[PDB]
Ligand code: HEM
Ligand SMILES: CC1(C)[C@@H]2CC[C@@]1(C)C(=O)C2
């Protein structure tokens with residue numbers, strides 16, 4: 001708890017801690033939605049994590065993500081020193097300047113590249129699921145959620161699988177620090193890892209993601225080694241944490257909900273619609289922006305330099321955006337969310353994520369149609385810049401499964 005700044009009023013203080021929320025034991029999204037109770041203002045100030053604003057409603061979150069003249073991406077993380085050290089590209093930049101770099105990032109993770117990776121993403125998911133199928137049980141986080149997305153990103157990036165444990169450790173410190181590393185120390189470690197590779201790939205350009213970034217042009221002039229490093233690093237973080245945690249949330253839910261399992265087994269063409277409704281319900285990111293000047297937003301005076309968390313998770317959980325928001329409805333008519341962000345920084349890896357998510361649902365449900373949480377397990381969630389699931393022990397009877 002940091003001492004309250006002169007310009008912030010007493011009645012908007014809502015001491016929420018985003019790395020360790022109060023009702024976390026009930027589920028991390030539920031823990032965040034305490035911010036949407038009837039008794040909580042649209043925009044509150046928490047004194048936790050150095051102090052910062054928290055917009056709690058989707059109307060405010062979208063407007064702040066659209067207004068980059070006031071809410072800048074230059075310091076997008078909380079606590080302030082992580083936000084200051086944060087210099088990844090394209091995310092730490094605002095438009096107009098941001099735009100050249102994003103186009104280049106889009107060339108290595110976009111839709112055309114999801115199309116090239118189609119065969120491998122399918123192969124690997126079938127493969128891992130087939131391997132687990134006869135055991136009748138798995139540790140989902142470790143046995144699928146991590147290895148499926150991660151090995152596809154290491155593949156794209158042309159990096160050896162033996163590097164996963166180091167890299168995933170650093171990525172987790174940047175999003176759910178355990179205390180052992182500052183955001184800045186984690187980031188430097190990641191750049192240290194990428195420096196030589198970028199240089200090798202500048203000499204002998206290849207087909208992999210690092211080569212493509214590193215030998216790229218940003219609106220016609222050559223990227224520097226420095227800028228390639230700051231783009232590559234973002235890419236690794238993006239490919240090593242969000243899909244991984246997202247898959248666990250979705251599989252935890254299906255494990256507790258036989259009727260939803262039955263719906264996709266009966267009607268698999270509903271899987272894309274169900275993925276979007278799961279991305280709404282089990283949204284997991286929350287980063288934010290910094291004020292470029294004094295500004296009055298929805299009746300609250302914001303001070304130049306003030307940080308504001310704009311939880312991308314909160315927009316589709318808001319009852320004002322979706323009726324009965326904690327309810328999963330695959331037939332939901334207008335699935336509204338900001339799970340993949342909003343404004344000029346819209347997730348560039350969202351096509352790759354949706355493909356991994358849909359392939360996982362289809363291929364898991366095809367081979368292991370029936371499965372549940374292990375008896376006696378209480379699933380724990382974790383909060384931070386990206387929220388996630390600590391471990392997910394699943395069981396099933398092999399006699400009900402099929403090799404495909
Ligand atoms: C469920 C999975 C994912 C979710 C929920 C998600 C969400 C987001 C969000 C909320 C942002 C914007 C943050 C901000 O405005 O500060 C973002 C940006 C971005 N994401 Fe994702 N993401 C996911 C997967 C991925 C993947 C798999 C990649 C591939 C490496 C990726 C790469 C990026 C990049 C490069 C940006 C930066 C866009 C810019 O700053 O212009 N993401 N993502
Ligand atoms: C908030 C994010 C998901 C988005 C991509 C990776 C991430 C952690 C950032 O650093 C940008």
Ligand SMILES: [K+]
Nearest residue numbers: 074083084086
């Ligand atoms: K910064």
